[PDB]
């Protein structure tokens, strides 16, 4: 099974990634949840169940960090750390990423079972 972590914001994400430095790290970046547990980001609401039922394809000794990037106002700021971070370089939420690899899925791709399986298996090709 995957070690699952849920954090709010870039600093909490950074701490989880550094504390799991040895492991195969997969990350999801999504809009923060309201008090009903729903992302402000419809594409994130859509992707959550597809990701949860594909987590089983992640390899042994894997960590999955679910990072809430903040509220919509914060996200829409093109200067925000997630977008400007030279490793993450987020274009959008949701993004599934294995940080430091081209293993990346964006937007509708995060709700695609075959793509999310390939992601967790590091089988996406970038021709």
Description:
The protein is of the alpha/beta class. The protein has one domain (1-127). Helix content is 31%, strand content 20%. A 5-stranded mixed beta sheet has the order 1-3-2-4-5, with helices on both faces. It is found in: Cytoplasm.
Strands side by side in the biggest sheet: 1-3-2-4-5
- Total of helices: 5
Rg result: 13 Å
Classify the beta-strand content into a percent band: 15-25%
Q: What is the H/E order?
A: EHEHEHHEEH
Helix/strand class: alpha/beta
How far apart lie the N and C ends?
31 Å
Largest sheet: 5 strands, mixed
Question: What shape does the CA trace take?
Answer: globular
- Which percent bin holds the helix content? 25-40%
Count the strands?
5
The figure for the number of domains is 1
Subcellular location: Cytoplasm
Organism: Oncomelania hupensis hupensis
Disulfide bonds: 30-44, 41-44
InterPro entries: Thioredoxin-like_sf, TXNDC17-like, TXNDC17_dom
Using brief descriptors, characterize the structure shown.
127 residues; alpha/beta; five-stranded mixed β-sheet; 5 helices; 5 strands; 31% helix; globular; cytoplasm; Thioredoxin domain-containing protein 17
Brief sketch in words of this structure:
It is found in: Cytoplasm. The chain has helices spanning 10-19, 42-54, 72-76, 81-84, 113-120, and strands at residues 3-8, 24-30, 62-68, 95-97, 104-106.
Write the layout of secondary structure elements.
Elements: E1 3-8, H1 10-19, E2 24-30, H2 42-54, E3 62-68, H3 72-76, H4 81-84, E4 95-97, E5 104-106, H5 113-120
Parallel strand pairs: 1-3, 2-3
Antiparallel strand pairs: 2-4, 4-5
Disulfide bonds: 30-44, 41-44
InterPro entries: Thioredoxin-like_sf, TXNDC17-like, TXNDC17_dom
Protein name: Thioredoxin domain-containing protein 17
